[PDB]
Symmetry: C2
Subunit: 414 residues, 2 copies
């Protein structure tokens, strides 16, 4: 209704579990607030150059701007932060990409990024983190990290189920817990906020299934379920058990030694994938001390959030980390950093996160060639030390490029 | 009743907020399971040598063994994992120290370490992490880390309030949430485990109060409240607001710029302590990229758990990290690592965690001199590269010592 659909261009189609991508697909993009105004132009330009180069003019993306966040209120009016037609247009065109998003405080508005994930049921937050050679790192051996994070997106304490201290609601549920359920375990029941943490069987088996499948499809070496199950037995500990059960039941997993670890034979390469588990706080220690031992990771919403932010910091990629939210019916690729308003409009932030999310988008579309040209470009620009301000501070002998120019530097190394 | 109280020795007394420590105090210690059998002898020996050296024979600790964990079932019978008299004896003698503890699986027994903390209301988990010069680290600059963690111990999802998927209880609370509270936000209400997350005003203001107080008493530069409040507004976000409120209300905090940060003038050194906050997942990134910016940290139970484990890994101290659980009526110092049963009895694990917890014990008792001799010993043994197996693997040119012998090496560098 305020989105203008491209006259040239054809909708991607879902013909039962498989994308049928035309040569001129319409892709919805959300520009993003803050520095989205800098990074999203850089991404449209390098993706265009990568499909122009890989398919020699046969394929072309018809980009369609849709709205969410601060720009949505400037287009539809001050009150609409998430238009109902963004949800419909992402549902319809199947794959979309977005920049950083501002959620307002003061108006009872819950996180717009988590709202897109939940409203569209994009239950997989996929976070690949690997080291790009030559980026400045705080650790001695960043090259040892090559992990892919499957974070569950639709349950955990992120479901937003909570009531304020001293609200009627809070008083009411605390009353139910103490009188009807007999909980004598709340230390101070007055002036007390309450949050609900759900974890279901369906919720964890659909995310773990996608994790093992990813591991078979890419011949990864192991799947690690991380959980804090010693303290949370019926939510986090239920996640590890349902995950091992699904590896037994659906993938024909077998005990290594006398457990708990399983082996799943890859039906294509013949190799064995270890299904193991580690407690979440020991895992935060293990990615730093023994990163080469881990590969595909499956975990719940909050842990997945902490794990990927932590891992993206140790490989030097807080600003070049890609991400995707994948459901059964659509997928949303995204800059995983914030809107950083102080730099907005200055053409200086790193466009690397949304560009590498666009290569995840292209690879998902089946446009592997265009996608390999982007990570080729990326490795070469970073190796050339022809780099953005955030990388140049920490490097010696680098050439400082604006946001837009690092875009050109990715095209030059293609 | 099976503890034998020392014939020589006198109880420490609490004479309103202040410990009155005799020259021959009786200290309860829990030996610990697993490698507790190796580390606790090493600690009794170096603490004895430190008080013998500092006070030239005037002071002496009368050690009293009390029981919890696997050793408790060998002394009181197979069913008693936590004797009621351990709780009483720690309450009574005021300060105790413990080794690692085995919680059994299969018998519905919840974490014995969290049970001691809750049952005794030791609401402060204090975790000091600093780098000891010369220990092998995975990061380029471990020397930049000097932080003290005030983790809340009595609320959060750690209160153990949860019900199994498909249990009657679970069905009942899910029914209450959907019908009486109107929650349409649980994605799959069948086969669903539920955990409760409480956060009260009293609970967070008593921990934040102790954090600021610590900062005044030791002239630390800042107190950072870390929370995941953008998603959990009424538990984690309530923690940051109550913490800033307490810094305004009780410490006379003033706005820096136009907020949110506050300044608290130290009434003894005249210096300004910054009260700031950072989101928990960005913080996990910031301790690795800008560790020199943080100092005292205040946070809830789960975050505090993750933060300290992560920070102890980057300074090389997964096995030499000390810790304390402090309440208004008693304190329990502890090895913060696990029972590691494969090494138990072999005299090879690092006794460093429980020894540095004993220096926290001595400092708490007011025996500062004996306590400075232990960290003097520690720095010198580690600097001598006269070290335990876990440190020697990662170092070149080290001399390998058994557990007991690293104890002697701490006494030799005193």
């Amino acid at each position: 209704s305020k989105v203008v659909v491209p006259a040239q261009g054809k909708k991607i189609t879902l013909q039962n579990g498989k994308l049928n991508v035309p040569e001129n697909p319409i892709i919805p993009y959300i520009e993003g607030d803050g520095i989205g105004v800098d990074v999203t132009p850089a991404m449209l330009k390098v993706v265009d150059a990568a499909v122009e180069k890989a398919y020699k003019g046969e394929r072309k993306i018809s980009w369609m701007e849709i709205y969410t966040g601060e720009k949505s209120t400037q287009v539809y009016g001050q009150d609409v932060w998430l238009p109902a037609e963004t949800l419909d247009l992402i549902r319809e065109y199947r794959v979309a990409i977005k920049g950083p998003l501002t959620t307002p405080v003061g108006g009872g508005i819950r996180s717009l990024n988590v709202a897109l994930r939940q409203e569209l049921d994009l239950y997989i937050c996929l976070r690949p983190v690997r080291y790009y050679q030559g980026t400045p790192s705080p650790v001695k051996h960043p090259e040892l990290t090559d992990m892919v994070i499957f974070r569950e997106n639709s349950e955990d304490i992120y479901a937003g189920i909570e009531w304020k201290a001293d609200s009627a609601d809070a008083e009411k549920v605390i009353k139910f817990l103490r009188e009807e359920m007999g909980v004598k375990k709340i230390r101070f029941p007055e002036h007390c906020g309450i949050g609900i943490k759900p974890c279901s069987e369906e919720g964890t088996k659909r995310l773990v299934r996608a994790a093992i499948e990813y591991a078979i499809a890419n011949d990864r070496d192991s799947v690690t379920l991380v959980h804090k199950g010693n303290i949370m037995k019926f939510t986090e500990g239920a996640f590890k058990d349902w995950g091992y059960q699904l590896a037994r039941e659906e993938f024909g997993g077998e005990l290594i030694d006398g457990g708990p670890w399983l082996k799943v034979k890859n039906p294509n390469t013949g190799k064995e994938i270890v299904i193991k588990d580690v407690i979440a706080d020991a895992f935060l220690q293990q990615i730093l001390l023994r990163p080469a031992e881990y590969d595909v990771i499956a975990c719940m919403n909050l842990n997945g959030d902490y794990i990927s932010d932590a891992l993206a910091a140790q490989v030097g990629g807080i600003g070049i980390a890609p991400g995707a939210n994948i459901g059964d019916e659509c997928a949303l690729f995204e800059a995983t950093h914030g809107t950083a308003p102080k730099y907005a409009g200055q053409d200086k932030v790193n466009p690397g996160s949304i560009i590498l999310s666009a290569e995840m988008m292209l690879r998902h579309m089946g446009w592997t060639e265009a996608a390999d040209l982007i990570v080729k470009g990326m490795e070469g620009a970073i190796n050339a030390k022809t780099v953005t301000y955030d990388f140049e501070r920490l490097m010696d002998g680098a050439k400082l490029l604006k946001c837009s120019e690092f875009g050109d530097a990715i095209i030059e190394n293609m």
